Design a protein around this ligand. Structure first.
Ligand SMILES: [Fe+3]
Length: 346
């Protein structure tokens, strides 16, 4: 049988009963542990994940965790994982620093269980908001509108795997949409959409590429299995950056790759409130189209709306492997700065 090349993510329609289970489990964990960063909760995370998640989610995520086959896209859309009460959530804060984690506590529990069922362990990075906790609120900040960050809006966020500049980048990501009233499409790009290993892709296994953090060590864009590889890629940071410092050969290879890759980008899915996108950060890159925060256009008219709000959680399947880059007193806190180099604070 000829290979069925994946061009889009797996879509799971979460049922009302599953949504009810998740809500009650979220509430129980809040009462039992206070918050999702409780060391007793984190230490018994996988036990809580397999015992408390709706069983179909547990089966999906378990299958996904160990699936690096030719058929695997590397992303799952869980449609309507949660019901967001928009009025209780109230207005979106001016930036991520104004997020009410007391209100997002239950969501943090739900997201950590999803990672826990992979199985994978939520982690935080000093490279991202000086850690900023296991759960990040991704909000369009008017001051950062034209930036190539999660606090951006007016500009296209070109496809990238999270933290391509780190040797210990996240294994898994979850993006929980609380609101997307601007109807911003989610953009995904899978290395598996290319199909069979070709000459353009083979050049990416060479450890000759700059992975700029946002004289420098170089890394491979493709790694892992030679036939069915893993990817570390950031189009904006490695290609569309004058200060990337790529060699003539490396830039050519990346340009050739980008030409082939850009035709495979999937921007079909527009997330709704309560959808969660779950990603294997070694298989699938993500991005977001340009938008004006707090508005959408319908019939050539501007409809004012509440500003985009999404929750991001990152995880690693092994605490052992990352142990030389984590805090002595916190094996879930990654202190890596750039491709092996650790942040030198004092
Ligand atoms: Fe990202």
């Amino acid at each position: 049988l000829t290979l069925e090349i994946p061009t889009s993510p797996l879509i799971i329609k979460i049922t009302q009963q599953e949504r009810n289970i998740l809500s009650n489990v979220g509430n129980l964990l809040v009462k039992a542990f206070g918050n999702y960063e409780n060391p007793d909760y984190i230490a018994s995370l996988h036990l809580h994940a397999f015992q408390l998640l709706p069983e179909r989610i547990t089966r999906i995520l378990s299958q996904f965790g160990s699936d690096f086959s030719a058929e695997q896209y590397g992303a799952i859309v869980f449609q309507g994982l949660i019901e967001v009460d928009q009025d209780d959530l109230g207005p979106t804060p001016p930036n991520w620093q104004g997020a009410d984690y007391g209100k997002l506590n239950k969501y943090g529990f739900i997201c950590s269980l999803l990672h826990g069922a992979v199985p994978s362990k939520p982690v935080q990075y000093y490279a991202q908001r000086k850690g900023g906790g296991l759960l990040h609120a991704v909000i369009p900040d008017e001051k950062m509108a034209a930036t190539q960050t999660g606090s951006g809006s007016k500009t296209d966020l070109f496809v990238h795997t999270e933290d391509a500049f780190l040797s210990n980048q996240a294994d898994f990501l979850s993006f929980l949409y609380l609101r997307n009233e601007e109807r911003v499409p989610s953009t995904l790009y899978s290395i598996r959409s290319h199909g069979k290993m070709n000459p353009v892709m083979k050049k990416l296994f060479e450890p000759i590429y700059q992975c700029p953090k946002d004289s420098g060590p170089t890394a491979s864009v493709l790694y892992g299995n030679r036939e069915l590889p893993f990817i570390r890629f950031d189009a904006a940071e490695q290609i569309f950056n004058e200060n990337a410092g790529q060699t003539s050969e490396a830039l050519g290879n990346l340009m050739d790759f980008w030409d082939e890759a850009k035709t495979l980008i999937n921007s079909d899915y527009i997330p709704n409130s309560g959808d969660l996108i779950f990603v294997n950060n070694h298989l699938c890159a993500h991005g977001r189209s340009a938008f004006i925060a707090g508005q959408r256009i319908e019939n050539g008219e501007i409809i004012k709306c509440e500003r985009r709000q999404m929750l991001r959680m990152m995880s690693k399947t092994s605490l052992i492997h990352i142990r030389s880059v984590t805090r002595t007193d916190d094996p879930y806190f990654i202190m890596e700065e750039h491709l092996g180099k650790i942040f030198d604070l004092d």
